[PDB]
Amino acid sequence: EEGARLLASKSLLNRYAVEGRDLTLQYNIYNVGSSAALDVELSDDSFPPEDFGIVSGMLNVKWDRIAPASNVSHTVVLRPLKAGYFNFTSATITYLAQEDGPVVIGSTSAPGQGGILAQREFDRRFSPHFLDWAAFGVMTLPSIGIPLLLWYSSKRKYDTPK
Amino acid sequence: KNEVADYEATTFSIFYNNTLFLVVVIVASFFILKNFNPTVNYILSISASSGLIALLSTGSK
Amino acid sequence: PEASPSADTTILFVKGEDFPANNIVKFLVGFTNKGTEDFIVESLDASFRYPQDYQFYIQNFTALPLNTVVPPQRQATFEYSFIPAEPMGGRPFGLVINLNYKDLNGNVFQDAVFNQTVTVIER
Amino acid sequence: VGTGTSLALSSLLSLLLFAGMQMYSRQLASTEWLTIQGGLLGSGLFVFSLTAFNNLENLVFGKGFQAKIFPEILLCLLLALFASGLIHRVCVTTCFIFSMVGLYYINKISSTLYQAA
Amino acid sequence: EACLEPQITPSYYTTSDAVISTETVFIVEISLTCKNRVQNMALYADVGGKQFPVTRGQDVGRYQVSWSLDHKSAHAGTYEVRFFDEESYSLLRKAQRNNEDISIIPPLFTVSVDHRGTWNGPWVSTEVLAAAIGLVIYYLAFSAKSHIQA
Q: Kindly write down the DSSP assignment for every residue of D52-75, as one continuous string.
A: HHHHHHHHHH-TTPPPPIIIIIHH
* N-terminal to C-terminal alpha carbon distance within chain A: 96
Q: What is the pairing mode between strands C91-102 and C39-49?
A: antiparallel
Three-class SS state of B21: helix
DSSP states of chain D: --HHHHHHHHHHHHHHHHHHHHHTHHHHHHSHHHHHHHHHHHHHHHHHHHHHHHHHHHHHH-TTPPPPIIIIIHHHHHHHHHHHHHH-STHHHHHHHHHHHHHHHHHHHHIIIII--
Largest CA distance in chain E: 88
List, in order, residues 6 or more apart from A126 with CB less than 8 Å away: A15, E19
Residue E148 sits at the chain D interface (C-beta within 8 Å): no
From CA C74, how far away is CA A108, in angstroms rounded? 11
List, in order, residues 6 or more apart from E127 with CB less than 8 Å away: B30
Residue A91 CB neighbour total at 10 angstroms: 22
Strand partners, A56: A77
Tell how far CA E56 is from the center of its chain.
20
List, in order, residues 6 or more apart from E145 with CB less than 8 Å away: B12, B16, D5
Class of residue A108 by CB neighbours under 10 A (exposed 0-12, middle 13-18, buried 19+) = buried
Residue D111 sits at the chain E interface (C-beta within 8 Å): no
Q: Identify the sign of the CA torsion A161, B5, B8, B13.
A: positive
Residues 8-47 of D with CB under 8 A from E: 8-9, 12-13, 16, 23
Largest CA distance in chain C: 47
Which residues from E are below 8 Å from A21, CB to CB?
A: 17, 20
Q: At what angle do helices D91-110 and D32-61 cross, to 10 degrees?
A: 40
Three-class SS state of E11: strand
**Are E141 and B16 in contact (CB < 8 Å)?**
yes
Method used to solve the structure: cryo-EM
What values do phi and psi take at D90, rounded to 5? -60, -40
Task: List the single residue in C30, C68, C74 with the smallest CB-CB distance to A110.
Answer: C68
**Are A154 and B19 in contact (CB < 8 Å)?**
no
Task: List the single residue in A1, A104, A109 with the smallest CB-CB distance to C78.
Answer: A109
**E135 membership: H or E segment, kind and range:** helix E127-149
Which candidate, C99, C104, C108, C106, places its Cα nearest to that of C78? C99
Task: Confirm if B12 and A158 have CB atoms less than 8 A apart.
Answer: no
Tell how far CA A128 is from the center of its chain.
19
Going along chain C, which residue ranges are E strands? 7-8, 11-13, 25-29, 32-33, 39-49, 57-70, 75-76, 78-82, 91-102, 108-120
Task: Confirm if A58 and E57 have CB atoms less than 8 A apart.
Answer: yes
Tell me, in Å, the resolution of the deposited structure.
4.1
Q: What is the pairing mode between strands E109-115 and A71-78?
A: unpaired
List, in order, residues 6 or more apart from E5 with CB less than 8 Å away: E34, E35
Going by the DSSP 8-state scheme, the letter that residue C23 receives in this structure is S
Task: Confirm if E84 and E94 have CB atoms less than 8 A apart.
Answer: no
**E88 membership: H or E segment, kind and range:** helix E86-98
Residue E113 CB neighbour total at 10 angstroms: 18
From CA C3, how far away is CA C111, in angstroms rounded? 4
Subunits with 3+ C-beta pairs closer than 8 A to A: B, C, E
What values do phi and psi take at A6, rounded to 5? -120, 125
Class of residue E66 by CB neighbours under 10 A (exposed 0-12, middle 13-18, buried 19+) = buried
Residue E139 sits at the chain A interface (C-beta within 8 Å): no
CB environment C18-41: b (16+ within 10 A), e (fewer):
ebebeeebebbbbbbbeeeeebeb
Residue C84: C-alpha distances to residues B29, B38, C93, E143 (Å): 25, 20, 11, 48
E121: alpha, beta or left, given left = phi > 0 and alpha = psi -120 to 50? left
Q: Nearest residue on chain A to B22, judged by CA atoms?
A: A140
Residue C24 sits at the chain A interface (C-beta within 8 Å): no
List, in order, residues 6 or more apart from E94 with CB less than 8 Å away: none
The answer to whether C and B touch (≥3 CB pairs < 8 Å) is no
Three-class SS state of B15: helix
From CA D64, how far away is CA E60, in angstroms rounded? 93
From CA E85, how far away is CA E1, in angstroms rounded? 8
Residue E68 sits at the chain A interface (C-beta within 8 Å): yes
Going by the DSSP 8-state scheme, the letter that residue C3 receives in this structure is P
Which candidate, B51, B49, B13, places its Cα nearest to that of B33? B49
Q: Which amino acid is at D78?
A: L
Q: Identify the sign of the CA torsion C53, C59, C65, C69.
A: negative
List, in order, residues 6 or more apart from E124 with CB less than 8 Å away: A133, A134, A137, E130, E133
From CA C60, how far away is CA C98, in angstroms rounded? 12
Strand partners, A112: A88
Residue E86: C-alpha distances to residues B54, E54, E107, E110 (Å): 75, 11, 11, 16
What values do phi and psi take at E34, rounded to 5? -90, 140
Task: Confirm if D39 and D91 have CB atoms less than 8 A apart.
Answer: yes
Q: Nearest residue on chain B to A137, judged by CA atoms?
A: B22
Which residues from A are below 8 Å from C77, CB to CB?
A: 7-9, 106-109
List, in order, residues 6 or more apart from C111 with CB less than 8 Å away: C3, C4, C7, C9, C98, C99, C101
Q: At what angle do helices D74-87 and D91-110 cross, to 10 degrees?
A: 150
Which candidate, C47, E144, E83, E73, places its Cα nearest to that of A159? E144
Task: Confirm if A8 and A110 have CB atoms less than 8 A apart.
Answer: no
From CA A92, how far away is CA A155, in angstroms rounded? 74
Length of chain A (residues): 162
E31: alpha, beta or left, given left = phi > 0 and alpha = psi -120 to 50? beta
**Are A147 and B12 in contact (CB < 8 Å)?**
yes
Residue C17 CB neighbour total at 10 angstroms: 10
Which candidate, C61, E42, C68, places its Cα nearest to that of A10? C68
Please count the residue pairs, one from chain B and one from chain E, whose beta carbons lie less than 8 angstroms apart.
Answer: 30
Going along chain E, which residue ranges are E strands? 11-14, 24-31, 44-47, 50-53, 55-57, 62-69, 77-84, 109-115
Task: Confirm if A127 and E20 have CB atoms less than 8 A apart.
Answer: no
Strand partners, A78: A23
List, in order, residues 6 or more apart from E30 with CB less than 8 Å away: E8, E9, E10, E11, E62, E63, E64, E83, E111
- What B13-16 contacts at long range (C-beta under 8 Å, 24+ apart), as own/partner pairs, is B14/A143, B14/A147, B15/A143, B15/A144, B15/A147, B15/A148, B15/A151, B15/E141, B16/E141, B16/E142, B16/E144, B16/E145
From CA E18, how far away is CA D78, in angstroms rounded? 49
Task: Confirm if D43 and D71 have CB atoms less than 8 A apart.
Answer: no
**What is the SS3 string spanning chain A?**
CCCCCEEEEEEECECCEECCCCEEEEEEEEECCCCCEEEEEEECCCCCCCCECCCECCCCEEEEEECCCCEEEEEEEECECCCCECCECCCEEEEECCCCCCEEEEECCCCECCEEECHHHHHHHHCCCCCHHHHHHHHHHHHHHHHHHHHHHHHHHHCCCC
Which residues from E are below 8 Å from D18, CB to CB?
A: none
Task: Confirm if C122 and C89 have CB atoms less than 8 A apart.
Answer: yes
Three-class SS state of C88: helix
**Are E134 and B30 in contact (CB < 8 Å)?**
no
Three-class SS state of E90: helix
Residues 104-133 of E with CB under 8 A from D: 128
From CA E138, how far away is CA E144, in angstroms rounded? 10
Is the backbone peptide bond immediately before D71 cis, with ω within 30 degrees of 0? Answer: yes
From CA D14, how far away is CA D49, in angstroms rounded? 6
**Are A62 and E19 in contact (CB < 8 Å)?**
no
Tell how far CA A63 is from the center of its chain.
22
